[PDB]
Amino acid sequence: GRRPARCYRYCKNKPYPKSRFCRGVPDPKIRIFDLGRKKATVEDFPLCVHLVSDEYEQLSSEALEAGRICCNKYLVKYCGKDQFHIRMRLHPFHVIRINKMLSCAGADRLQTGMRGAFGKPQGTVARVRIGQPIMSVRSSDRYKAQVIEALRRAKFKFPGRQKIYVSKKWGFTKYERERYEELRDDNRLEPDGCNVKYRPEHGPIAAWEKAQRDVYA
Amino acid sequence: EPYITWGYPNLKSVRELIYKRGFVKHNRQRVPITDNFVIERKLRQAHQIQCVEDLVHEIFTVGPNFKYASNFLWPFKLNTPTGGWRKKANHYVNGGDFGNREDQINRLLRKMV
Amino acid sequence: MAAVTKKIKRDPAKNPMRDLHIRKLCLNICVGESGDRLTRAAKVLEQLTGQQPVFSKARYTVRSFGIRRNEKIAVHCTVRGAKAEEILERGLKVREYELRRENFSSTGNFGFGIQEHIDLGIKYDPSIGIYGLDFYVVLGRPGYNVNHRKRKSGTVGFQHRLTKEDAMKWFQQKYDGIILNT
Amino acid sequence: TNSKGYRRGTRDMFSRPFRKHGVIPLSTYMRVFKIGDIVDIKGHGAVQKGLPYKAYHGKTGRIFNVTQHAVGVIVNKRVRGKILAKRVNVRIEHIHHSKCREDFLRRVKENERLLKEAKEKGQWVSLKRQPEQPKKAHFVKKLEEPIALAPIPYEFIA
Amino acid sequence: AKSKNHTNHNQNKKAHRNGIKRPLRKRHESTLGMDVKFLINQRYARKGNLSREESVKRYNERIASQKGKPKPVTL
Amino acid sequence: KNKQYFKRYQVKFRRRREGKTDYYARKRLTFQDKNKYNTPKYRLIVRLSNKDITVQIAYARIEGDRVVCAAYSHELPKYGIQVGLTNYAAAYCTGLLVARRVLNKLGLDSLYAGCTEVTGEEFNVEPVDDGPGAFRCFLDVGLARTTTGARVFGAMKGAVDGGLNIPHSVKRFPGYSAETKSFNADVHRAHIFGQHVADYMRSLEEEDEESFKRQFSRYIKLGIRADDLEDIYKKAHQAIRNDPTHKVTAKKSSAVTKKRWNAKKLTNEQRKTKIAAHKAAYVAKLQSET
RNA sequence: GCCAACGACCAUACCACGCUGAAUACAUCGGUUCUCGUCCGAUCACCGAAAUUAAGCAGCGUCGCGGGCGGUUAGUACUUAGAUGGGGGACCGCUUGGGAACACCGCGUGUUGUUGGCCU
RNA sequence: CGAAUGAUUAGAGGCCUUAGGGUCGAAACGAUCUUAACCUAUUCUCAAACUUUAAAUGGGUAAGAACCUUAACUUUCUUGAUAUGAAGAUCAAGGUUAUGAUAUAAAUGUCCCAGUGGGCCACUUUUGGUAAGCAGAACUGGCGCUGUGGGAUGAACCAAACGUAAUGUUACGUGCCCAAAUUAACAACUCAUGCAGAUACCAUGAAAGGCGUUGGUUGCUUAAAACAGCAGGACGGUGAUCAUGGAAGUCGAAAUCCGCUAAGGAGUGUGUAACAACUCACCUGCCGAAGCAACUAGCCCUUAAAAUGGAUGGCGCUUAAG
RNA sequence: CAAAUAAUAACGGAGGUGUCCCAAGGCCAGCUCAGUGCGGACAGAAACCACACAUAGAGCAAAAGGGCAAAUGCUGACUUG
RNA sequence: UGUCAGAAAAGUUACCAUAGGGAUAACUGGCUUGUGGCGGCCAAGCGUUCAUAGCGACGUCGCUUUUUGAUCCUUCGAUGU
């Protein structure tokens, strides 16, 4: 009956999955994890900005669903329609159950009062850790200020506390912006959609001249 | 470690503990010192210890009969410090007591001897 | 690539020991279902080959053709070495040696299929009925029994191992067929 | 409420190691086991005959018996709280030679090699093991590129 | 009414009092459940030691009469 | 197949990768008991080839099998048999050569003479009294297919003719039919002396006389005629019983540094200068673009 | 420097290709009277000799894959023991010891035993 | 998790002939390939019943006369063709008993000797349960079975275990209750109008704020005269359009380009029906010295609601007695 | 579950048992399995024949787990330990 | 001999009896709150126009046991429901 995560705040247990051993797990009504111009190249969007957890919370699926829409609707309103890629980096494969007590008609007595406790899966949640990102939006550097307010508006719909980090990376790639700019300035960053390809010395040699036949020609 | 403090004794602290507090073990009994015959009658045929300064020698400069020079003694039933303690359940390096005081075992033996 | 080869050539590395002869010829008659029809179909090949053939059983059940586990649907045999060159060219002018293009496996074997089994010098003989057959010509060089011995086995390598385009090369010369690009 | 029965919990005990599957190497049957030899037990999951039961994996016994395929090993089990010495007939593939004492026996071999040439000097033969004594007084020279080379405590910001 | 079964509480206090007890070290451990054809006239490899030094160092030259068995034992 | 079953790839041993050993028989041939503590077992190893018959006696030790006696077929020219080195007949010599090669050096040739009265019957040596029996081997065939009359069973009767105690049954001796057994020593006696090789070259001047220049060539070169083989092999069965001296040679001393051909492999300073000019002259070739 | 039979350890040995190869060898190869086995002399069994750049252990080559060892990650993560430490909690700091792992980069790419031979 | 098995998110490069049909074409292969399959180099995030790797704390064993090397005897069982194995029984030869620390005396029997076989609490790890002064376990320490000192009070917390006395010295405390500092000892912090706050466990209180005050981090303006303020303009190239509550400097708003100089905004507005003005920019002033924001975490405040009258233990404390 | 020896609880979680087997036991020999690719008249998404790749991805009365490739899998040989 | 260390075994009592039990329910008291409601943040939006005159989605953080479960601690030589 969708009781909130208001009184869940000692969470203890090893993650029961949605696997071949508790089959009966539902289709999620929370599916999409990423939105914006997700077909943008690496070069389009240099700025990465994360919303990073500095607690050890248990962020709900409905909290994560709500916080993406509030991060979406501010960015399609202010900084342009398709100048962003939001990546919601917490995929909630958890099982919170419920002992439901079907106590209709007040008389049955059979099923469970305190004996015995098999459960029924209702929840789905994500453990966060300290320093561990929750969502990263990728956009240009002209809309740096517009980016942080949409992450601020998403802060007030998550539990715990969260810190908004402009990352000094160049996009979603794990490069310093200077080390991205130097390594792309000769050959070595062969681009893909979200990510680049790295510094190849192996192997074997056929994709070295193919670089050299496409640096000159 | 948390039930114990230790450190590195002076020569003066070796003497004052055996002079003032040094008792000795004579056929499982505890026998004070009062003369050199209590030390000599048990450690001169086997080992070469007859005096008190013998027993102060092969304890301070750790000699080859240290095993006998320190199991001859009883455990030194020390007093209580004057001024007392520091915390007793923090390390010495936290704010003071247990573990290695390391040269400040001397100042604390002045209070206990 | 360009790793140094150094290619020491005391002889031009031609192929005297690399014959590309015929290993064996496979003659299948996949009759649909069991009964006495295979028995009158099996006896057409002792007429053709002299060897008495074997009764292959069906692996699965289909319910769409009517075959089950072990229901004895086909009859096959195999002819190896200079007696296939009876039954190859005797069934190849029936196909008027010019043969289709694939029809030629990448493994170097090739094959074809003819209906009307009485074009093999066989009189029509309505006691047995006519049949459609399955001619498969596996093909190979000397040294192909390197992976066939039980003691101290091995694999053949790149060259030797003959492509599709050297079975076609063997076919434009022997029987002088054309490859019929379809 | 189980342990009960006999290979339970031994999903990882009698597993094989990674890529150590298959055929047993042949020196496993070429080892010689004489009566009174120290011997570890680490069971082989790929030999389902003569496996020890799970309490004795990881333990160490002495060979009290040899028969045609197995060794009787006498192993200590604490059945609480007391130690019975258990006699376990265990096949040879599940049994190893202990290295623990053949680096004691290379010291009996040196407590008679060093006491041999000590008939000339005399003393100290020094035939006891000594724990790690505190170090010495020693003169660390710098020179080495004189110091500072000075750390300061600083790595947080990200 | 169904109160409290199964605990290993106190069970090592209670088993370390009369202590945790090594068995004891024997010079003569039993030969029983041991290989019986190893044992049954190695019973008589003892019973064939009627003497061991008087009539036995006679044997060191009694077989050195035939110069021992120095070669042919090498198969 | 792509990097990820290679990570999970567990090879077979080395010799089963190369066809040499069973290891399901090697486990069971080299089995010694554990209350037979370090006693060797000395199996008899006859491996055939195309133009050699290697018979050996090896016992199982950990850092390798140790070969105690090794008689080959490429020495039977010294005993009066020049061609046909891989016969059923020419195996019984290397069977008999490896038995007399080892009983003289074990001193067990005064006793355990053997069977010079070569008949093809079953022959099992009763132990010479004043002590136990003779040297035991066990036949190790590898994965030769052990069907009746193979040459690998043509060294077990050769070695048991020397006097070794190898356990038997005549089921795989050439000339013992399958309905029933039906012992017949004479076809074994024919095969021992090389009769049916002689009978084929006495049946080939009746059918196709030109095929002497085919099969049974080099009998034409060395002049061996077909009626000689029953007395070529017969007079070899005592010239082998009279000089089993192991064929030891003494070059003294030319094995190591021979003489010129150490065959070094590309010291890594060269490989990093190999791909100095391979990289530099490629972009100069790509400077021939412009 | 090698060749063979039998091995041990069981990828530093594997996999993909490429290129050499003196000599003994090992082969492929020829045949089906014999022994033997097949639907078939392909395989197996047996007789035994007319051509070599395939096996084979290799000689190797590869900014090869895998695998192996080192470095680095990192005194990091975790963790023993301590406190009348912190904080509303979640959890975090310090004391006292112990101390990883992926990856990442670099390195090498079977070692050897017995017994018979060859000598480029 | 760029290793297998299970999941799972996104794109990127393509074998292709799987197309879901296309697209310029009747299908076209005459071209863009459209997308989705399939393949390959990557990617986000993960597993009680997954794992190449792999700790800490653990489990076992060893660390010597019951020993170490010999010599040649016994054996039917014992093996070998060995009455050399392998076990055993004897003589030979071996400095200094082969880490450390300890020894509450340890060893072994018998009464199978009595009581017991409801437990309970706690750190740490745990399972069920929304939770529980709830249910169930692992580990060691405790209460039961135990006084005494401290936490006002209290089974268990902290300290310490206890013959009967004298003396001296000790963690909790030192404004009064009440033994001992209103410390000839300090630096700060904090003003709480209906519980300021006041010692662990522990007797609850959050999210989010404060131009309350205290410290701190980042960026701009600045000794070109800013900041503030008294002193100027802010209309318009035009209802371009968007538009009739309606946009004439303006809801919305695809869109977006222009005044002037010392210096004026197609301009945010309750709605000034639509208009006007007006004024928080610009810049000439006087001023002539620091100003501006954003951010952080100390205390206090706020958030903060119960029933007999009332509880830092009580009094009472505010350059403290927090 | 279970906290890296073993032990370890709850009406904790996920299942299984009360049988089947003259071979599905014993043993030798031969053999290689999942799937995948290129092929071969009728014949297709699959019938069969045949080549190449196949680290077990199959199979083993096994519920789950371990294990296993000239086998413990598949086929024959005699068999009753 | 499946209650599997192995009696040979159907109900009902509101007409009831006995020994006990707070080792055990029924109500009070205690802890607990999934359920209801009452608050505070963020602001999609509603309100002609206008995000907060009055509201207020998706989230989020608390307070409240009394209904109501859960619990079995105190009482069964009796606490009047």
UniProtKB/Swiss-Prot annotation, chain A:
This is Large ribosomal subunit protein uL16. One of its GO terms (cellular component) is cytoplasm. It comes from the Eukaryota. It comes from Drosophila melanogaster. One of its GO terms (biological process) is translation. GO terms for molecular function: structural constituent of ribosome. NCBIfam families: PRK04199.1-4 (NF003239), uL16_euk_arch (TIGR00279). The keyword Ribosomal protein applies. Pfam families: Ribosomal_L16. Component of the large ribosomal subunit. Mature ribosomes consist of a small (40S) and a large (60S) subunit. The 40S subunit contains about 33 different proteins and 1 molecule of RNA (18S). The 60S subunit contains about 49 different proteins and 3 molecules of RNA (28S, 5.8S and 5S). InterPro entries: Ribosomal_uL16, Ribosomal_uL16_CS_euk_arc, Ribosomal_uL16_dom, Ribosomal_uL16_euk_arch, Ribosomal_uL16_sf.
From Swiss-Prot, chain B:
Binds to G-rich structures in 28S rRNA and in mRNAs. Plays a regulatory role in the translation apparatus; inhibits cell-free translation of mRNAs. The chain holds residues 140 to 252 of 252 of the full protein. Signal peptide: none annotated. Keywords: Ribonucleoprotein, Ribosomal protein, RNA-binding. It comes from Drosophila melanogaster (Fruit fly). The keyword Ribosomal protein applies. One of its GO terms (cellular component) is cytosolic large ribosomal subunit. GO terms for biological process: cytoplasmic translation; maturation of LSU-rRNA from tricistronic rRNA transcript (SSU-rRNA, 5.8S rRNA, LSU-rRNA); pupariation. One of its GO terms (molecular function) is structural constituent of ribosome. This is Large ribosomal subunit protein uL30. It comes from the Eukaryota. Belongs to the universal ribosomal protein uL30 family.
From Swiss-Prot, chain C:
Signal peptide: none annotated. It is found in: Nucleus; Cytoplasm. InterPro entries: Ribosomal_uL5, Ribosomal_uL5_C, Ribosomal_uL5_CS, Ribosomal_uL5_dom_sf, Ribosomal_uL5_N. One of its GO terms (molecular function) is rRNA binding. Its main location: nucleus. Pfam families: Ribosomal_L5, Ribosomal_L5_C. GO terms for cellular component: cytoplasm; cytosolic large ribosomal subunit; cytosolic ribosome; nucleolus. GO terms for biological process: cytoplasmic translation; translation. Keywords: Cytoplasm, Nucleus, Ribonucleoprotein, Ribosomal protein, RNA-binding, rRNA-binding. Component of the large ribosomal subunit. Interacts with Fmr1 to form the RNA-induced silencing complex (RISC), a ribonucleoprotein (RNP) complex involved in translation regulation, other components of the complex are RpL5, Rm62, AGO2 and Dcr-1. PANTHER family: 60S RIBOSOMAL PROTEIN L11-RELATED. Component of the ribosome, a large ribonucleoprotein complex responsible for the synthesis of proteins in the cell. The small ribosomal subunit (SSU) binds messenger RNAs (mRNAs) and translates the encoded message by selecting cognate aminoacyl-transfer RNA (tRNA) molecules. The large subunit (LSU) contains the ribosomal catalytic site termed the peptidyl transferase center (PTC), which catalyzes the formation of peptide bonds, thereby polymerizing the amino acids delivered by tRNAs into a polypeptide chain. Belongs to the universal ribosomal protein uL5 family. This is Large ribosomal subunit protein uL5.
From Swiss-Prot, chain E:
Pfam families: Ribosomal_L29e. GO terms for cellular component: cytosolic large ribosomal subunit; cytosolic ribosome. GO terms for molecular function: structural constituent of ribosome. Keywords: Phosphoprotein, Ribonucleoprotein, Ribosomal protein. Residues 1-28 have a biased composition (Basic residues). Signal peptide: none annotated. InterPro entries: Ribosomal_eL29. GO terms for biological process: cytoplasmic translation. Residues 50-61 have a biased composition (Basic and acidic residues). The modification Phosphoserine is found at S30. Residues 1-32, 46-75 are annotated as: Disordered. Belongs to the eukaryotic ribosomal protein eL29 family. PANTHER family: 60S RIBOSOMAL PROTEIN L29. This is Large ribosomal subunit protein eL29. It comes from Drosophila melanogaster. The lineage of its organism: Eukaryota, Metazoa, Ecdysozoa, Arthropoda, Hexapoda.
